Design a protein around this ligand. Structure first.
Ligand SMILES: CCCCCCCCCCCC
Ligand SMILES: CCCCCCCCCCCC
Ligand SMILES: CCCCCCCCCCCC
Ligand SMILES: CCCCCCCCCCCC
Ligand SMILES: CCCCCCCCCCCC
Ligand SMILES: CCCCCCCCCCCC
Ligand SMILES: CCCCCCCCCCCC
Ligand SMILES: CCCCCCCCCCCC
Ligand SMILES: CCCCCCCCCCCC
Ligand SMILES: CCCCCCCCCCCC
Ligand SMILES: CCCCCCCCCCCC
Ligand SMILES: CCCCCCCCCCCC
Ligand SMILES: CCCCCCCCCCCC
Ligand SMILES: CCCCCCCCCCCC
Lengths: 246, 246
């Protein structure tokens, strides 16, 4: 009676799946697989009150279950990581995230039970297995507090006598700029010797976190830097070489 | 009687396989393998009602099954991932897919139980084991909503006084173009200092998602950009060097 009821349930499931609008042969194969595994489970369970062997059945069931357990590790890992994300996740729907270990950069769209759906900046869907979030570091640029501006000013080696005044002028301009966060790091210093130029580092932050406003402020700062450099008699350096003719 | 029936079934299977048009010796070897494993299973199962040892049989069967379970992990993994794809797959037949972790780029042709068949853009078949889709991120360019246009304009360092007007003109042209999606990101800004040029970024989207129309729109935009740049008295920059002669 139990077998008949289970077979009726499987047949009803197959009929509903076909009604849902899917392939015939695939549905039949799935039904056959479910029937086979149901029979195996019943035999492993009812192999004593009806069957005779004990040690053989125990060993066969044990080895089968051991193989099944080893084979299905990844799907179960995805499911468990989905549960963990449901209880504790370091992001929300609509958050821009990325990682230094894998390529998952984009905006979160859906958090499912097996995979997480992410919309890339190319406007494409990306499906990430949930088990990744248990082993990689996740960064959340969607929750930043400031945008950083960094650049390098490369002056010619003949302009070594103007580095101090140029650095002072650039620092003053950055200190008096209305778009720069004065409570963050602000560094302008002659930093290193390069192959063809003397490099000056620039390091600051903007109050805004919006893409377009940050880009506009950066462009304004760069143009002001160009004006400052050219007003003191210095100039930017191309790659340079010394040639001995023969 | 059970052994005789099983051997008859195996012989019938071998005869049918030969009738299907395959090698003789291979069929005989497969039949021998199936016979050997059937005998082993029967001995492990019927080793008490006929046999005598219990602990030895249990240990032998356990170690054999443990080795078999470890060895057959990958095939079972492929089968289980095929089942999971049957129930939940992030693509359909005819979808263009790719991945940042492996090389699987192409169009989906068949989704089998062990492998998935993909037609590459080289017009070649590619067979991907199903277990890959449980551990790698899958991207679906076949479901995009827009095509992105990105490029860089590199002006000479002597054209620093025209960057603002050139950026304004390019932004206006992009805003008035009939092929550009005005509801998406649209950025044109002086972006960075390069070794030989001042770089301007361009970032926009097209309404269409068709390959040929996107390429045509991109070509039109590039030609318009060239005209805009050359009309303001600026020019594109070749790689540059400063040479000191001796
Ligand atoms: C009408 C809903 C039918 C749902 C069928 C679920 C089948 C689960 C099989 C589990 C085998 C261990
Ligand atoms: C062609 C449809 C029937 C395929 C049956 C496959 C059975 C595989 C059994 C493997 C036992 C280790
Ligand atoms: C035609 C359907 C064939 C289904 C075969 C299922 C075989 C499962 C083998 C599991 C080994 C542990
Ligand atoms: C929406 C219905 C989900 C049904 C899941 C069935 C799982 C069958 C597992 C078979 C393992 C051999
Ligand atoms: C129509 C399908 C014929 C082949 C079925 C093979 C079933 C093998 C089950 C093995 C369980 C361990
Ligand atoms: C082998 C383990 C399979 C586990 C499948 C769990 C599916 C849960 C889905 C819940 C929402 C549909
Ligand atoms: C099987 C995996 C279960 C994971 C459970 C995680 C529970 C986290 C609780 C955090 C509370 C703030
Ligand atoms: C006429 C169809 C014959 C199918 C033979 C299947 C053999 C399965 C062997 C399983 C050994 C555990
Ligand atoms: C040449 C045809 C017969 C080959 C027999 C190989 C048997 C290998 C047994 C290994 C036991 C560990
Ligand atoms: C000529 C056919 C030889 C077949 C040999 C099968 C040996 C199986 C060894 C399995 C060890 C666990
Ligand atoms: C289409 C017929 C499929 C038959 C599959 C037989 C599998 C034999 C497994 C032997 C393991 C030692
Ligand atoms: C014609 C084949 C002769 C060799 C057969 C060797 C069988 C070894 C079986 C080992 C089972 C563990
Ligand atoms: C060692 C495990 C082998 C499992 C083989 C399953 C084959 C299923 C095929 C169903 C469609 C032909
Ligand atoms: C042995 C692997 C079984 C995998 C079953 C996955 C079930 C997913 C259900 C999703 C419903 C939308």
């Amino acid at each position: 009676i139990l077998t008949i009821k289970l077979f009726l349930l499987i047949n009803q499931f197959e009929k509903q799946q076909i009604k849902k609008g899917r392939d015939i042969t695939s549905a039949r194969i799935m039904s056959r697989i479910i029937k086979i595994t149901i029979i195996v489970v019943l035999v492993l369970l009812y192999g004593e009150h009806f069957g005779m062997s004990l040690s053989g059945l125990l060993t066969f069931g044990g080895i089968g279950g051991l193989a099944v357990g080893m084979a299905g590790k990844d799907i179960l890992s995805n499911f468990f990581s989905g549960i963990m994300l449901y209880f504790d996740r370091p992001f929300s729907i609509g958050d821009w995230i990325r990682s230094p270990d894998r390529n998952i950069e984009g905006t979160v769209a859906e958090i499912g039970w097996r995979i997480t759906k992410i919309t890339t900046f190319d406007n494409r869907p990306l499906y990430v297995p949930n088990s990744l979030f248990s082993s990689i570091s996740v960064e959340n640029p969607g929750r930043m507090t400031n945008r950083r501006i960094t650049t390098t000013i490369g002056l010619r080696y003949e302009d070594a006598a103007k580095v101090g005044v140029i650095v002072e002028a650039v620092r003053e301009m950055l200190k008096n700029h209305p778009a720069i966060d004065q409570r963050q790091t602000l560094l302008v210093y002659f930093n290193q010797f390069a192959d063809s130029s003397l490099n000056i580092m620039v390091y600051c932050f903007t109050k805004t976190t919006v893409w377009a406003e940050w880009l506009a402020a950066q462009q304004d700062v760069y143009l002001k830097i160009i004006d400052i450099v050219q007003s003191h008699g210095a100039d930017f350096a191309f790659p340079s070489q010394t040639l001995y003719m023969d």
